Amino acid sequence: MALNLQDKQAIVAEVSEVAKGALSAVVADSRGVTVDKMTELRKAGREAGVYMRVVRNTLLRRAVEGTPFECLKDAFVGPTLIAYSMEHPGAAARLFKEFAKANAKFEVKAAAFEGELIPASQIDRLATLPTYEEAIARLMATMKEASA
Amino acid sequence: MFTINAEVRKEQGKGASRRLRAANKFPAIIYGGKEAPLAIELDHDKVMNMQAKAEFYSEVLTIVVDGKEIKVKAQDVQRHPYKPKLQHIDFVRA
Amino acid sequence: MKVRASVKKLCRNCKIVKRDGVIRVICSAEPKHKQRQG
């Protein structure tokens, strides 16, 4: 490994994603294959490319060293194996969705999805999301309200 | 930067020199300037580790011989014919 | 097993053991590497 001069970058970089981010998910990759990463990188791909991460770090000692910053709801995620996912642009989006759909294709556990932060809380798969731009679901709420 | 503590030699000659070397010390001498030469005795393992760096032979370096700081340059070294140890050093006064 | 006077590891799996007064070599992969009189 590297000394501190390197354990600091994995911090100053990874914590300015939290400081400058959008949504957060969860997942434990016990059996995390590489067809695994391959896929989810195309997903990050659709979800821009390299706007996304997953930098395995669940050393509390790392991606909690980014938490007493923001998201101290994660002192509780960080135990055991974890795969932290941050969003920069994009809706508070679909990121959420396929992690459940992925891991529900066996694709290993999902930490039961211990969940995360947009609010400041816990678990439950939501597509309360990428409807986003479904302001059309407030366009159809126009003419249909005007007519009916 | 190299700080070398040392002591003036109380004994000189083949007899003493050998004795010193049995006790992980080793003789060396400071000469140069317009003032007399000085018979030094140095701690071995120390100068060894120090002289491991190449700067030892380039940089000016300082010897604290009975509280003075003489400040000198390494002229010449005597290494053991077949061991990894030092026999003697010539220091030039700078 | 080979007997020899100099024994030494051969495979990365050869192991070296001091049983009784005698120095040995045990390989979990390759029987040819057993050694004694070490």
């Binding site: 067809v35 391959m38 990188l41 791909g45 490319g49 390299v50 294709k105 | - | -």
Partner: protein
Amino acid sequence: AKKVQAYVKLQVAAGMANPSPPVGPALGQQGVNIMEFCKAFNAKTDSIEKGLPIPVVITVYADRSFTFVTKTPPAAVLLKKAAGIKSGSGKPNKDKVGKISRAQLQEIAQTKAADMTGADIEAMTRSIEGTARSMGLVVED
């Protein structure tokens, strides 16, 4: 495909799917049907092009028949009909012999867009650097 089971790739040919000395039998003989790669392959052959290198995987269990898959061409080979020289040395690579087309290497690599990890299609280029410094043949960039 979320589960591999059987795959042997031995670059075939399009214009007539009916070999015998190169592959022929050895392409289908363990629950595989020699009768159906001339019924099925050529059904996915003529839409594109014919003659040149075709690695391939098939869907044969022990289920009599099957369904054929397609693939992609080798990448240092697109430096033959897609560069110049067709060997790679002549003076063993104690000598840096070859010679490149910088324009090519991107769009000629890009032709292999469907089988690479780089997000940045420029990245997919940077891979072809070493793939094309495979001898030490410098590119006139």
